Each structure stands twice: as C-alpha cells, then as structure tokens.
Amino acid sequence: GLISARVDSHSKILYARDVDQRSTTFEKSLLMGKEFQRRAKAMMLRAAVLRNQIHVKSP
Amino acid sequence: KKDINNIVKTLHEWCDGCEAVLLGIEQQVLRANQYKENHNRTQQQVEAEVT
Amino acid sequence: SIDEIYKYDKKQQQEILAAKPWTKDHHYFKYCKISALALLKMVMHARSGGNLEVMGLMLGKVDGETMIIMDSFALPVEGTETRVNAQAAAYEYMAAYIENAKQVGRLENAIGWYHSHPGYGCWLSGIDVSTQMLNQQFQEPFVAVVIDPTRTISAGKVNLGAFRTYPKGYKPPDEGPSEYQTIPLNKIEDFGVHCKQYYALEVSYFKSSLDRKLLELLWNKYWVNTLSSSSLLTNADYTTGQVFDLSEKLEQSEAQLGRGSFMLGLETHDRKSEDKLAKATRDSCKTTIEAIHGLMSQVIKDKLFNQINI
Amino acid sequence: FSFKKLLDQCENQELEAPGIATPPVYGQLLALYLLHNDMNNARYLWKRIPPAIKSANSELGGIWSVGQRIWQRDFPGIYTTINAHQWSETVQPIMEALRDATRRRAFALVSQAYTSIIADDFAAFVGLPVEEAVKGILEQGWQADSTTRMVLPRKPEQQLARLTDYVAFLEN
Amino acid sequence: SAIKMLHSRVKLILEYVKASEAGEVPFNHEILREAYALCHCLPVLSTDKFKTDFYDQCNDVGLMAYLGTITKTCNTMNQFVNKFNVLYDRQ
Amino acid sequence: SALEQFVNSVRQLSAQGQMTQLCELIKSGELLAKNLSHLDTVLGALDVQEHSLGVLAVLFVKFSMPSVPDFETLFSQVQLFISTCNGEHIRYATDTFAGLCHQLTNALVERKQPLRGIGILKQAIDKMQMNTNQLTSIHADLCQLCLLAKCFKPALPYLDVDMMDICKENGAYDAKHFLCYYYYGGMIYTGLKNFERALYFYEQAITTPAMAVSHIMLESYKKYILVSLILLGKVQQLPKYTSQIVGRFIKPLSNAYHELAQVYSTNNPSELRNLVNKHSETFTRDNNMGLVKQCLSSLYKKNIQRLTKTFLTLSLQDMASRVQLSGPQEAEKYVLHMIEDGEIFASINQKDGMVSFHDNPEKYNNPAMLHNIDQEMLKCIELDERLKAMDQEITVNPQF
Ligand SMILES: [Zn+2]
C-alpha cells in the first residue's frame, strides 16, 4: 500500500518517510551501475562461450 | 601602524591559493588535451591509412 | 608576411572568382582560407539567434585552389533548414554593404552565404538541399559552410566544413567527405536522399600577428572570467529538459532500435540500420560534457575563489 | 604488520612444511586468524590441518577452542579458552594482541553498537571490569548510567582529473 | 572576468606593495589597511555547510555525468554487439 | 636404448626451427622402459627450456609411481622448466602440455599433497595465461587441489578476478575446465560467502551453450539457486540467454529447487527440514552440509528485511514471533547480529534493547563516496574502451 512511512513499533506510531530524490537517485544509480558491470563481465564471458564454441554435448 | 612586512608578505600567498588549485585543474585539462592530441593523432593516422 | 594573406588582391581575388575552375573540375577548391568573421558572428549570432534559422551573404574571395570566407554569420530570422532557397533573402545586406565597403577600400564583392541553425547547425536541409544544389548550379563557387552553434557550445572545437556540394551530374569522387550529421525528422530523410552529394574544403584560417597578440592579451585578463563560469548556474533546470530529452534522446536510439522485423536488413526503409543510437550517443556526449562545463567551472572557481591562499 | 606478517609467515609454514606443518605453526596460524577475527578460513584450516598434528599443538587445541568461542562469542568463556594456556612465541604474545584487538573491537561495540551498554557487557568483552567501564566511558567521553547499568557509549587537478576523464571519455 | 582582471591587478599589487614599501612610493597605509583586509581575509570563501553543499554540487554533477558516460559505455557495448550480429550473431 | 640422442636434435630445433612437435613427439613408443628416465637423463638440449617438457612427459610415459616423491622432486624439477625456461612459448604442444599437467593433478589428488603446485607451476601458467588469471587447462586442476587442501586464498588471486581472455587457447582446454573451475568458484564464494559471485558463475555456466545434463550443471543449478534464495532475498528469475537443454533436460530435473523456491515462498521450517531430508544426499555430497541452516539464514533474512523498512524499533519477543527471534534474548544475540553482521542502521538501546532502523549511509556526502563513484567510473570507462576495441575487432573481421 501507500505507506511511505515508518513505525517505531516500540513507539506505536507511524512516521511518513519523506520521498528521497537525491540519495534514492544515488541508490538506483549505483544499483544499475553494479548490474551493468556484472552484466559487462557477463556479456564478455558470453561472447567468450560463443566464440569459444563450447556446448555441453549430451552423450 | 607599519604593517608593511605582513601585508607585503601576503599578496602572493592568496595568489598561491588560486594558483595551486587552478593549476591542478589546468594540468588535468592539459593532460586531457594531450589525450585529445593522441586521439586526433590516431584519427589522422587512420586518415592516412585510408588513401 | 603574416599580413600577406590579409591582402585582398581584388585583382587576384576576383580573377580566380571569374576563373571557373569548378566547371573544369568541381573539386578544384580544396582549401577554404577564412578570416575569423565567419567564426565571429556565425558563432555569436547562431547563439544569439536562440533557435532561429538564418541565411544570407558571406564576404570573401578565392586564392589559388581555395574558397575564402572573409565573413559568415547569422540573421535574426527563421525558416532556414526549411526555406526554399533561404539564404538569398539576406543578400540585400551586402547588396548594400560590400558596395560602399568599396568606399573604404573594401573593394571585395559578395562571395557566399552567412547563416546559422541556432542550436543545431549551419547548413542546408532538405528544402535547403534544393537551395544548396540549385544554387551551386546557380552560383558555383558555392559552399555549404557547416558549423553547429550548440555543438560548438558543448564541443570546444569549431567543426568547420566548406561543403561544395556535388552538382547534379557530378558525383562524389575520391574526396567527398559528406559530413553525416544527426538531423531532425524534418530533413533526415532528404539528407539520406542527398548525404553524399557534397565535399568539404580544407578550411584554413589566416590572420595577422596583431591578431595573435590580441587573443593572448584577451586571455590575459579573461582568466579571471575563466574561474567564474560559472557553468552550473547557467543551466539550472535546463539539463532537466536535457535529461528529459536526453533519455528521450536515448529513446531516439530506442525509436530507431525498438522491432520484430526479421529478415535480412532494413528491408522496408532506412532504419534503416538498427538506428539513432548514434544520435543519443552525440546527445550523451554533449550533455555530459556540458556537465563537465558546469562542474569544472564551479569546482575550479572554488579551487581559486573559495580557497587559494591569504 | 605483525598480525598480518606473522599470519602470512604461518601460511607459508603450512604451505611448505609438507598439508602437514608444525603444530605450533598451526596454533600460530589460528591465533593470527583470530587476531584478524578469521572464522571461515580458520575453519578451512581446521578442516585442512592434520588433527593429529593439531593436538600435537595442545596450545592449538586451546586456540581452536577460542576459535569455537569466536564462532559463538560468549565473552568470558572466550577469554577462559584464552586463559587456559598462555604460550609465548606461539600463543600468548599474540594472545595479548588479540585481547587488545577485541578491546578496540568490542570497544566500538560498546560505543556504536551499544546505544546504551551494560558494563558487564564489555567487562566480558575483554575483561575490563565495570568500574573499569566507568573509567572508560569517562575517558573516551561516554555517559555513565547508574542504577540501571544502561551506560551511555557516546558515538564520536583532483576533481579536474575526473572531469577531464569525463571529457577524454566523451572526447576519446 | 573578476579572476584574471584582479589577477593582473594583484600582480600589479605585488609590485605595488613592494613599491609602497620602498618605491614610487613611500611607506603606504592605503596598501596597509586596504590590501591588509583584502589578503588577510583570503583565501576568502574558503568556508565550510558552504563547501559542504559545494561537494553536494560535485556529487550530483559527477553522478549524472558518469550516468551519461555509463549510458555511452553500454552504448558502445551495443555497438560491438551489433557488429557481432552483423558478422557473428546468427539468430 | 635409442632414447638418448634427442638433445642434439632439440638443439637443432631449440634456438632453431619448430619446437611444437619437438615437444609433442615424445613417437618414441610413448610407453617406455628405464629409457624414459634416460630420456629424463638426456633430452634437455640447451637448458630446461621449452623442450624440458619433453623430459617431463617422458617421465609421465611410465605412469608407474605417479605421485611418488618425484611428486615433489620432479615437481620442483617441473617448476625448473616452470621457472628456468617455461617461456611465453608454453603452447608449442598446448593440449599435450595441458593433459600432462592434468596427469600431475591426477597423481597428486590421488596420493599425497594437493597443496603447493599453485605458484610452483602458475609461473608457466601465466607464461600461458595472460591477464585476468585466465583459465587454461590446469586451473580446474588448481582449484581441485585447493578444494582438497581447503585453502582457497592462494587461488583467490586467480579467484577474485572475474577472468576474461580466458586461455582456452583452442586445445589445452576442455569445456569441463570451465565446468569444474567455475563450480569450484561457486563452491568457494559460497564458503567465501560471496554468493552473488557464485550466482553469476552458475548463471553464466547454465546460459552458456549446453546440451547434456550434469551434476556439474545440476550442482551449478544447486549453488546458483542457493544464492538466489539463501543469499538473496527470494527467487532469482530465469536468466536471459539460458540454455535450451535445461528446460529440455535439467529444468524438469530441477524438482529439487522447484520445491526449494516453493518452500522458500512457504516460510515453513517444518517443510524446510522435510525438503532437507529429501535432498540430504546433496546435503552430504561434496562437504556441502548445512544448506538447511543456509536456507534458515535466508528465512531470517526475509523476516528481518521485511520488518526493516516497515518499522523503526520492535519488541524482540514480539519480533520473536515476527522473524522467529526465539525470544528477545535469542533475539538479543540476533540484534547482536544486526549491529554485528553489517545488518542494521541501528544501535543497542540496551535500556530497552531497542534497535532503530536508519538507512542513513551516505548522500555520497563524503568525497570518499564520490570516489566510490570514481572507481565505478574507472570500471565503466575502461569497459566502454574495450567495447570500442572489440567493436573495432568485429570491424577487423574479414568482411564478405
Ligand atoms: Zn532550402
């Protein structure tokens, strides 16, 4: 649901989270950065597995 | 009264602050331009190759 | 002499003007000797033109195998990049100017077409390719003098190309540059229709020693301005549109890289070729370099203003 | 450093002795691991070391007991495994080093991990007692708390390089 | 503008305070009070919060700039992949 | 005993013409008497150069007493070639040299000491492999060995590098080199607990072209999806260019982790242990017991991470019901983990043992975070640079 909010359940109160622009942007930024970098080496090694012509023959 | 020593000593110091930081950016640019030279240089080399 | 080329030998210049080497080979003009009037109001009147396209008459001459741009600049006008032979309508400028320019010893005559596509170039589009081609069969020696204002804003270099287009009947020989450039939807099709019908001139620049001393002395008090760009402050939410355009600029690539059409190529229409990713490429390059502008500006200002020394 | 230096040395010891090295080599490896708080690679070693030659190092027996504790980390028992044997040159000169490492470590534990801390906590963490705890909160600037033991551990060009690299990338 | 204007100005000012020491010029209080306040406020604008938000600038700017550069990175990645598809990808 | 006079011919090839078949001829019978030692006696033409591999393989020609004390002596002796003149020309007889090294691996994994071959021979390995600790033949061998002697740090130089330009070198390499080596890597960064790295390894190995079934592939599946659930918050999704035969063969075989992801969704400890008893075989199969405790760790991961953004501070006994904190006191050791295992922006409100979520690491508001970004930048920039170089190279392809 719409909960942009927090609760100290020790407090028994809700506390609406402020929608972060800056550091949420930082979050997504380095998230996609790590994703892209993993996938960078990933596609490098996929280009390898395809250039290296390796396939797991059934027998 | 007669401050001349300190004040005179002093002008260059401020100048040095700007000089140092500004220079750092300058050289970084210079090196970058140098890269430009090699990049353009290689580009020209390929140009030569095409003929 | 350094002033040996500033010498406008109206004799020699108009001699090679009536020389018609282009009718013998339309690739004779390989050079384009320019005096910096082109850069002058070309630059600041493409930029001061906002986004309004312009047109008209360039001052200049010819030397050896060289077109010469003594002048090129912009109008406070529009319509260029889509006008049926735009440039003509500003020639009234040196319909008068050059005339009594001769009254001061500017015995030059009209040579070319000043213009600017504020924000996206200085050239002749599809209808202006009608302009360019028709006029080079009208007006040769004629050039597509090409430099982009906002490209020269976020680029740091003047990509000048004097594009004597290949007249109808004359194909690009060995040397046709044909500077491919990312065009809006209005004229990209007609550029593909005419992208390989022009070559570039070896655009050199000529000046005096006083010119060099003046530019150095310019820098010698502009450096204070250098550390006051003061570049971030200029485009506060500009880049937002940039960003909101740039991803759409990126969606440009998307637009030409979205498609299911399997088959063998682009095999329906020019897409073409997988596409517009190069468009978004130039987009990302220019926008990150303008970010470079802002950041180096404000950061080096900190480097000098905020703290140097006592 | 002596921790890292000695541990690398003991590594080379195990590497070059045979996976059969000296039992004191074993205890030194394990003590240096715990100096570095190693728990998984230490368990590799334990699963990579001759258990006969391990028990040859009964000091290493106590050291693996202490590693078990650092795997569990109930503190007084950790130091009791510590304070079973205190062997110079294979055990104890870095036994002290590791109790001190735990001092700084559980120290930050008190400070940052504990908003409030029971003095018995860090009294177990390295042995520094509760009155030692009052002295420590007072010396590092940490609020004491009486009647509760909820004592208060008080939490205490270059850019042109990157920018010209932006350019050099775009202006490759 | 301010920067290099007062750059030449303060090179002049160094020669000029050497003169006001002495030169001509005698010992000078104009230099004293005026350039004293000037230089000994320097490096002015070297404050903190202030440069804190300067680094906030730097964070956002480097963020988005490297964002675009990442975009160009994966761009040339796709470029290579498309040349692959031309020469190599048989799908 | 005609196995004597090859030194002159090798001098007539070493510092001379071809060395490839010079090294891969020993022709000679290939299963000889004492002359093998006599080839070991007189075969080293100039020095312990490229051809001294000939002497080595000749010693292999027996395969009697394979990992006997020569397993170290000739080991260093091989290291002699591996040190003296292994040379960048490791690959005259590439696949033969590789399989010979595998013979060393065979004998040693067999008998005595899977400990020290790493640097003793990675000399000539890097004389073969170039940059990223690039997998030639013997890398499966080496990670095999450090899996025997469970010390994986020495290959962590080779391990932590996500290698590229892998030195398969078209011979002196098998697909099972990849298979073994990277299931090794997954195993290790499981024990190393860089589980996402193993997720990467096994996703690549599976999306890699394949047609057969294997507990290479089956256990790649295993540790991969263990990462996806035990490590990760919950089920990883199907990769992009996955292999066909998986869905053909191994995906229908995948009932293990069908029930895995199922019970993970279920949050049932009882069915947890039921599936545990189910696959206790795989639990035992490769010293890989404790996978159940791993899944339970992921359980508490789910519970905690759930409660994280939802709360600020909670009763550990109440959250003993929530996360399964086993009372607030076992939850005391749990909160211990929270501030302990890099688990929470929160501290010990030991007055009430309270644990207030913050998630306030950085706005990159320290320039060191800006340089975090900077090394991000380093990676992505050199990445695009090599993208351009390879794009070139496809342009470098012979067209038409
Ligand atoms: Zn037109």
Side-chain angles (χ1 to χ4, degrees), chain D residues 14-15 18-19 40-41 44 47-48 73 112-118 121 150 155 162 166 169 172, chain F residues 113 115-116 149-153 191-193 339 347-351 370-371 377 384-385 388:
Chain D
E14 173 63 28
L15 297 173
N40 285 319
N41 287 319
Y44 287 108
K47 309 301 187 293
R48 188 180 62 251
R73 293 177 182 175
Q112 291 178 355
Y114 290 92
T115 300
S116 65
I117 186 170
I118 274 174
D121 300 332
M150 302 304 104
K155 278 72 167 169
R162 76 195 72 183
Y166 283 162
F169 179 76
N172 275 310
Chain F
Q113 289 176 353
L115 183 65
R116 80 291 311 283
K150 294 289 190 292
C151 183
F152 303 90
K153 281 72 67 178
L192 296 179
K193 298 180 182 179
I339 305 169
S347 175
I348 297 164
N349 184 1
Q350 190 175 6
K351 175 261 176 65
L370 188 58
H371 298 293
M377 192 186 297
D384 183 75
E385 298 298 328
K388 292 186 179 184

Side-chain angles (χ1 to χ4, degrees), chain C residues 219-225 227-228 232 250 262 277 281 288 295 298-299 302 305-310, chain E residues 1-5 7-8 39 42-46 50-51 54 57 61 64-65 71-72 75 79 91:
Chain C
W219 178 254
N220 291 321
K221 293 305 298 297
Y222 182 77
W223 56 271
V224 188
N225 302 318
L227 291 175
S228 61
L232 289 179
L250 301 179
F262 189 74
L277 187 60
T281 303
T288 299
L295 190 59
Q298 308 298 324
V299 171
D302 182 77
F305 298 123
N306 287 322
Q307 198 280 332
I308 283 293
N309 282 316
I310 296 88
Chain E
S1 64
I3 292 173
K4 192 170 183 178
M5 188 67 73
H7 168 73
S8 180
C39 295
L42 299 172
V44 190
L45 286 301
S46 62
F50 172 75
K51 293 184 179 183
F54 174 77
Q57 159 195 350
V61 176
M64 190 180 288
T71 307
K72 181 176 181 291
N75 184 1
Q79 298 292 324
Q91 295 300 111

Side-chain angles (χ1 to χ4, degrees), chain C residues 270-273 275-287:
Chain C
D270 220 340
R271 184 27 178 118
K272 291 140 343 276
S273 147
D275 109 71
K276 283 180 181 179
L277 187 60
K279 297 180 184 179
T281 303
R282 178 69 269 171
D283 296 328
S284 67
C285 294
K286 68 176 180 62
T287 305

Side-chain angles (χ1 to χ4, degrees), chain C residues 79-87 124-132 134-135 187:
Chain C
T80 306
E81 175 75 25
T82 58
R83 284 180 179 173
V84 181
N85 196 1
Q87 63 195 2
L124 287 184
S125 78
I127 296 91
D128 278 327
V129 160
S130 295
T131 304
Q132 183 82 42
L134 289 170
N135 289 314
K187 308 297 180 288

